Scaffold this active site. Structure first.
Site, PDB file in Angstrom:
ATOM      1  N   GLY B  95      12.117  -8.332   9.535  1.00  0.00           N
ATOM      2  CA  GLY B  95      12.786  -6.853   8.976  1.00  0.00           C
ATOM      3  C   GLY B  95      12.674  -6.241  10.369  1.00  0.00           C
ATOM      4  N   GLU B 116      -8.374 -25.959  29.399  1.00  0.00           N
ATOM      5  CA  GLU B 116      -8.121 -25.653  30.827  1.00  0.00           C
ATOM      6  C   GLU B 116      -8.021 -24.327  31.064  1.00  0.00           C
TER       7      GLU B 116
HETATM    8  N1  AR6 Z   1      14.270  -2.525  11.580  1.00  0.00           N
HETATM    9  C1  AR6 Z   1      14.071  -1.459  10.745  1.00  0.00           C
HETATM   10  N2  AR6 Z   1      14.384  -0.312  11.365  1.00  0.00           N
HETATM   11  C2  AR6 Z   1      14.268   0.931  10.854  1.00  0.00           C
HETATM   12  N3  AR6 Z   1      14.357   0.965   9.399  1.00  0.00           N
HETATM   13  C3  AR6 Z   1      14.013  -0.211   8.720  1.00  0.00           C
HETATM   14  C4  AR6 Z   1      14.198  -1.494   9.506  1.00  0.00           C
HETATM   15  N4  AR6 Z   1      14.326  -2.626   8.431  1.00  0.00           N
HETATM   16  C5  AR6 Z   1      14.090  -1.873   7.274  1.00  0.00           C
HETATM   17  N5  AR6 Z   1      14.205  -0.515   7.565  1.00  0.00           N
HETATM   18  C6  AR6 Z   1      13.977   0.716   6.410  1.00  0.00           C
HETATM   19  O1  AR6 Z   1      12.589   0.586   5.783  1.00  0.00           O
HETATM   20  C7  AR6 Z   1      12.585   0.154   4.430  1.00  0.00           C
HETATM   21  C8  AR6 Z   1      11.591  -1.124   4.549  1.00  0.00           C
HETATM   22  O2  AR6 Z   1      11.807  -1.671   3.353  1.00  0.00           O
HETATM   23  P1  AR6 Z   1      10.527  -2.412   2.824  1.00  0.00           P
HETATM   24  O3  AR6 Z   1      10.903  -3.218   1.406  1.00  0.00           O
HETATM   25  O4  AR6 Z   1       9.257  -1.459   2.372  1.00  0.00           O
HETATM   26  O5  AR6 Z   1      10.301  -3.299   3.859  1.00  0.00           O
HETATM   27  P2  AR6 Z   1      10.703  -4.632   4.328  1.00  0.00           P
HETATM   28  O6  AR6 Z   1      11.189  -5.778   3.157  1.00  0.00           O
HETATM   29  O7  AR6 Z   1      11.930  -4.390   5.325  1.00  0.00           O
HETATM   30  O8  AR6 Z   1       9.711  -5.409   5.225  1.00  0.00           O
HETATM   31  C9  AR6 Z   1       8.589  -6.232   4.595  1.00  0.00           C
HETATM   32  C10 AR6 Z   1       8.089  -7.193   5.524  1.00  0.00           C
HETATM   33  O9  AR6 Z   1       9.126  -8.168   5.326  1.00  0.00           O
HETATM   34  C11 AR6 Z   1       9.760  -8.535   6.805  1.00  0.00           C
HETATM   35  O10 AR6 Z   1       8.906  -9.604   7.190  1.00  0.00           O
HETATM   36  C12 AR6 Z   1       9.435  -7.295   7.437  1.00  0.00           C
HETATM   37  O11 AR6 Z   1       9.402  -7.544   8.792  1.00  0.00           O
HETATM   38  C13 AR6 Z   1       8.262  -6.798   7.060  1.00  0.00           C
HETATM   39  O12 AR6 Z   1       6.918  -7.719   7.820  1.00  0.00           O
HETATM   40  C14 AR6 Z   1      14.122  -0.073   4.263  1.00  0.00           C
HETATM   41  O13 AR6 Z   1      14.572  -0.082   2.966  1.00  0.00           O
HETATM   42  C15 AR6 Z   1      14.994   0.519   5.258  1.00  0.00           C
HETATM   43  O14 AR6 Z   1      15.163   1.744   4.733  1.00  0.00           O
END
Ligand code: AR6
Ligand code: AR6
Ligand code: MN
Ligand code: MN
Ligand code: MN
Ligand code: MN
Lengths: 157, 157
Positions: B95, B116
């Protein structure tokens, strides 16, 4: 002593002496098995330019604790609810970020909504098949997808 | 179209439309078992302010491929060499970052150097005990440490 270079929406970039550090909200992920299939999800991930195999996961929002965030993510991404049990946590990449993921198991899943967030594809798949597709180069894993597959093979067969 | 806000030593920060993206070098990690103990390492990690339980891991340097980086990291961090087999890869947190980790198994380990690199603590520990210490709140995991523990319980008992 952190000096901030960028304060954003889901991360901050700081320098701490010579270290580059990304502050990031904590996350949750849910492992769920039904009839030998694990609940995976896929969505386009601009950071990597592809859609890896993940398990339902999300960021913890203000006011929430991990269990509550896990319940919410499972419902929003897949339309399901279940009986949740905390398993373990991990730092995704502690050489540069503080992001911590709390992992839950879900049992006795029921549909509470007609999935529902459309940009996420629900992918029920036997974990044995997810591992085989990965070994043959056909799909990439996120850490959460790999953790789900390995946890299943360790403890859920 | 990425716009770069910061170009660093082990990461870049970019914006791609509304997305905040951290570019990061790929990594390797090595799972190794000897006499029922897994080879963990611990080191202070300024991003998290503590020393999580990890497995030997490092960044791939220019010119290297994953196998070569894995050999190097295992020797530099623990003084050991072994017969390496590629297992699988994962995106640590797709993400927001493109960091990808390639995981290897090491067998038939031998000491090639008197560990080491001194800032890394070599922690041989039964994976069952690492999981119990984590469940009781006594140690945190990195993703690589958790992957090592789960892989052992799935496939190495
Ligand atoms: N890089 C980003 N930048 C800005 N906003 C973002 C981004 N990615 C998503 N959004 C916004 O933020 C909201 C995030 O959606 P949620 O489901 O709670 O999280 P997840 O599934 O992304 O992340 C969950 C984990 O899975 C992965 O391993 C990730 O790296 C995390 O570790 C989105 O709908 C967007 O509006
Ligand atoms: N945040 C940082 N900023 C600047 N330089 C760094 C930082 N951290 C370390 N260095 C420097 O860079 C060199 C890196 O040491 P190597 O062993 O190849 O990598 P690793 O073990 O750190 O990271 C391996 C993975 O494990 C974790 O999950 C990580 O997040 C990675 O995913 C250091 O000696 C420092 O000189
Ligand atoms: Mn999500
Ligand atoms: Mn979501
Ligand atoms: Mn290292
Ligand atoms: Mn190193």
């Amino acid at each position: 002593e952190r000096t901030y270079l960028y304060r954003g929406r889901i991360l901050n970039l700081a320098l701490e002496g010579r270290y580059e550090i990304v502050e990031h909200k904590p996350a949750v992920a849910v492992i769920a098995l039904r009839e030998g299939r694990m609940l995976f999800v896929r969505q386009m991930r601009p950071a990597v330019g592809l859609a890896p195999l993940e398990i339902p996961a999300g960021l913890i929002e203000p006011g929430e604790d991990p269990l509550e965030a896990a319940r919410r993510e499972l419902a929003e991404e897949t339309g399901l609810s279940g009986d949740l049990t905390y398993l373990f946590s991990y730092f995704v990449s502690p050489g540069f970020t503080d992001e911590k993921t709390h992992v839950f198991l879900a049992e006795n899943l029921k549909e509470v909504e007609a999935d529902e967030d459309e940009a996420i594809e629900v992918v029920w798949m036997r974990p044995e098949e997810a591992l085989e597709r990965h070994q043959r180069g056909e799909v990439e894993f996120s850490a959460t997808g790999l953790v789900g597959v390995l946890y299943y093979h360790a403890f859920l067969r």
